[PDB]
Structures are given as C-alpha cells and as structure tokens.
Amino acid sequence: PLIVPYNLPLPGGVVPRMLITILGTVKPNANRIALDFQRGNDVAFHFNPRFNENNRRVIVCNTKLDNNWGREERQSVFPFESGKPFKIQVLVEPDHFKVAVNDAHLLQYNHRVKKLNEISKLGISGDIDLTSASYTMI
C-alpha cells in the first residue's frame, strides 16, 4: 500500500552484499515496470520489463549518462505475469547487480557506473501495486 512512483533512499550508496527486496502485484493490463538506481541525474542501472514491445515481452536494461541512454542489454526470459504477485531481489556484487524474481535467478548487469557509494536512490515506477521495498546486508 505504498504510493508509486516510490523513491527508496540508499543511505551512503550501494555496497557489495546489499540485498534489496521489492514485493508487489502487477496490474491488470500492465505495460511496463521500471527500477532506476540513480547517481544524481544519471541512471546507473535501469531495469525495465516491457509487456508489449511489438507483441513480445522483453526485459531491457541500460544506463543513462548525461541524459543519454547507452547500449541496451535485453533478456527474453520474462517471469512477470499481469495480475499476479511478484518478488524482485537485487543483490549487489562486486562487479555486477544480480537480479532474481520469485526466487529464480534472472540476470546480471555489469557495473558501468563504478562509484557505487554515489548510487544513493532507487526509484520504483510503472504498472504495479507496491507492497514493500526494503534492504538488508547478507
């Protein structure tokens, strides 16, 4: 019962062994979800499930620097389902973000923005009801 878009501060930035857990439900008739890990105005890691990109479901990942998007990484494994509850876990490792959905590994994204301590906010947006968003160390 949190308001979307939601901004989760990450005090002192991200560090290896930080685990972020996001619980919610995908809306009826969803088009998109987005997670945006921010370094100021830059987007260090954009994680973007798209439910209807030319009649295909795809996950797009990218980085935005100085208002310019870079090279997209795309994943066709698509674990989200319209109408249904999900869990996203993002584990920060030394060289990449590791993403699992509903307890199954989905993808890794190599760090392009290398000042991890400066990635200090997470924005959560899109066609979801958000139940909780939190972090811990493992």
Is 126 within any annotated ligand binding site? no
Is 70 within any annotated ligand binding site? yes
Inter-residue contact 8 to 122 (CB < 8 Å): yes
Is 118 within any annotated ligand binding site? no
Q: CB within 8 A of 105, min separation 6: which ones?
A: 98, 99
Using the CB atoms, write b or e for 54-92: b if 16+ within 10 Å: eeebbbbbbbbeeeeeeeeeebeeeebeeeeebebbbbb
Q: How far apart are the first and last CA of the chain?
A: 26
Which DSSP string do the residues of the chain spell out, in sequence order?
-B-SSEEEE-TT---TTEEEEEEEEE-TT--BEEEEEEETTEEEEEEEEEEEETTEEEEEEEEEETTEE---EEE------TT-EEEEEEEE-SSEEEEEETTEEEEEEE-SS--GGG--EEEEEESEEEEEEEEEE-
Q: Where are the domains of the chain?
A: 1-138
Is 75 within any annotated ligand binding site? yes
Is 73 within any annotated ligand binding site? yes
CB count, 10 Å around CB of 136? 9
Angstrom resolution of this structure: 1.0
What's the CATH number of domain 1-138, 2.50.20.10, 2.60.120.200, 3.10.20.30, 2.40.160.20? 2.60.120.200
Write down the residue that tokens 């906010």 correspond to: 121
Resolved by? X-ray
